[PDB]
Design a protein around this ligand. Structure first.
Ligand SMILES: O=c1c(O)c(-c2ccc(O)c(O)c2)oc2cc(O)cc(O)c12
Ligand SMILES: O=c1c(O)c(-c2ccc(O)c(O)c2)oc2cc(O)cc(O)c12
Ligand SMILES: [Cl-]
Ligand SMILES: [Cl-]
Ligand SMILES: [Cl-]
Ligand SMILES: [Cl-]
Ligand SMILES: [Cl-]
Ligand SMILES: [Cl-]
Lengths: 151, 150, 152, 152, 149, 147
């Protein structure tokens, strides 16, 4: 498939509350690209601390959401849509590079992740791309993550 | 103003985390109507329990977000954008009627509140309308509130 | 089928969890007819952080929710008795809410008593109406229709 | 000096806030002698996520903490009456806890009643003792010595 | 030495009431040395207190209890997740509690408990909580180990 | 040393996004050594991951940025809570980050940051995060202080 909803995400990604930062996948090309998004609302606990009277979605959490998008792409490219294989996998950050934040992200924003596979070798996936709001680039990132069997 | 952001909503409504359920106001016509919305994301605490493995935005919180939008409309109709007067006012919701839920609301939805003034007599404000996702009606409700002093 | 049920039993019947399980105990239950339950109100609830600062008021919409959950417990047990194995495959959906009145604010230290009677029921669809009470006084009234559905 | 206090008044005297304000209402207060207060216990508390999964039990040490807070309220108001301005400059710090006994588990749906009495007081040092009760049954006992300290 | 993953398999306590992060020492029937890290990033500090974070004294005691229970359990049955699920460690009494120094974010809260006495399933433990070599609290505790249902 | 009370007077971050507990070394316009304790009793571990607590790599980086922020604030205006209270901090860039060892409950997460470059409100720092003398992460970042 090309479109996946929160139920599908919960079945593939190991991340849970308050660290599951992808809400919906709009397009997916195996081994190539993913487009997904997270809705940004005031009703998130991060906003209590970042910052009082000035809610700004943390830049590092944008990068995290981009990584989880790459991780969803990584897993399904490897095993397809298989929750039973998925439930015992974990995802580790290995590197982060060339990230630039251009526009602050705030409550009411639809934070759209666009990742493209730059290089992959087995469990090691290197993706790069942008986060977008209303068609504009708010962030750029390059990252490398590893899929690993939980032990 | 016509469009109000979270910064402005925080200065008018007393509601705070985890009970502020309006993120942005896109349309406002004094004494007539409001269009506002709240983004729905999995990263909300309510989804821990409603329900495990099946995230569905509570219907009662849709109604609550509709009430908050009605309240913002009422207050701004009376005083406009006035944070100082906002601190001295309470909007007490007295009744809720004719509410119907047609489509469930889930993480990834942009929950749009459409409310209009149905009746305004003195301190009493009667408002009603719909919640919409992607142009479709997901809920409807009528609500009555009283303006009072804090 | 007993008349009194405690949190451990409610937990095995209702699909609701923290922070949306708003019934603590069932005191009276009549299959297909009526239920009396309650939820204790304490300052130590996260909801009071934003409703409101320096003025804790239990949200009216959450009173309606608690009445629905009471109704749902009546619905499940009426249909299947105390059966955690069947209950576990189900969720509850709100269909309608009507005739709600908020008469008295609910605050920390209140014992929120839910009184619901069955107005109509057929299969999975249940219509209930009643009041929320604190120290024998009506704090709110509501009518609502809910449906029990497979979680698929 | 009143004998009944609600959450609004407790907030003005105690510095404790969420998730560590564990007294909801004061029912009796006699200066220098005693206090009867309570906290409602509900499933809708974060503490129950971890204590314990599938079996909600109110932590015994939190019962003690609530007894201490009731004791601290009694101590302060005995000396200054209901004085929010001065309360804001003072803090009750507990030095010792003794003879704690847990008799009955406290669960969601319980009204946890604190009964504290003054065993000894001289100036800022207050020694109190008593019980936590549910339905007139002693669920815990404790003795503690407190210190009315400067906040700065 | 036991790490968080081991602790989680023995104790039924979960967030926000698991208050032991690591066990550095354990001598069966004798003593335990364990610790909990204190960080500002804990929900307790929102209310205890605003503008002045202080780790609650009762939670220091809870951490000592949890340490004492871990000692008593592993003394009898060792590292056994299967049996752990069949047992309950409930605390009957606490006594001789003294708070000496306030515990704040940045502290490594170290629990030192010894077995004072035990007979059957009743275990009396006691000791101190320590930060950087100083006693911040002390307590005696009595537990009963029972069958879980 | 600067304690949490002092950290709160300078940094605008609050719970659950204040990820520095203590400042052990400060040298204006040069370097900072700080740390955060890692405990199981943090909300993030509920989702990262269930049954396997691992402190998020991105939050290691955030903790380093906040450490570098504290260095920036004080190098600019000294210990001045009055000025600090009007400001917030924006991430501008992140580069050359590598994670070596997972960070778990029980770890003392120590941040070492030196200034690479600064001009006005814009500060570029870089360094490492360490647990028990071992480098668990490297990073470079640029932040902006704003009214
Ligand atoms: O919706 C509102 C609301 O509920 C309350 C409120 C405040 C205190 C109470 O005790 C109470 O019952 C209600 O105040 C408001 C004030 C506004 O300026 C706008 C609102 O929309 C509300
Ligand atoms: O840990 C537990 C515990 O402390 C108590 C408890 C609490 C207060 C008391 O006064 C008491 O006698 C027992 O019950 C339990 C019941 C279980 O099924 C499992 C437990 O782990 C506990
Ligand atoms: Cl940021
Ligand atoms: Cl619903
Ligand atoms: Cl309300
Ligand atoms: Cl306990
Ligand atoms: Cl304390
Ligand atoms: Cl990571």
């Amino acid at each position: 498939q090309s479109q996946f909803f929160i139920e599908h995400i919960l079945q593939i990604l190991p991340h849970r509350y308050p660290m599951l930062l992808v809400d919906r996948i709009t397009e997916l090309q195996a081994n190539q690209k993913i487009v997904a998004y997270k809705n940004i609302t005031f009703n998130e606990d991060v906003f209590n601390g970042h910052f009082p009277n000035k809610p700004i979605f943390p830049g590092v959490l944008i990068v995290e959401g981009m990584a989880q998008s790459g991780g969803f792409l990584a897993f399904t490219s490897l095993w397809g849509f298989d929750p039973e294989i998925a439930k015992t996998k974990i995802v580790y950050f290995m590197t982060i590079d060339k990230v630039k934040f251009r526009i602050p992200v705030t409550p009411g924003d639809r934070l759209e992740y666009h990742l493209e596979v730059l290089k992959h070798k087995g469990m090691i996936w290197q993706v790069g791309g942008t986060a977008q709001v209303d068609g504009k680039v708010v962030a750029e990132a390059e990252l490398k993550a590893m899929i690993a069997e939980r032990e």
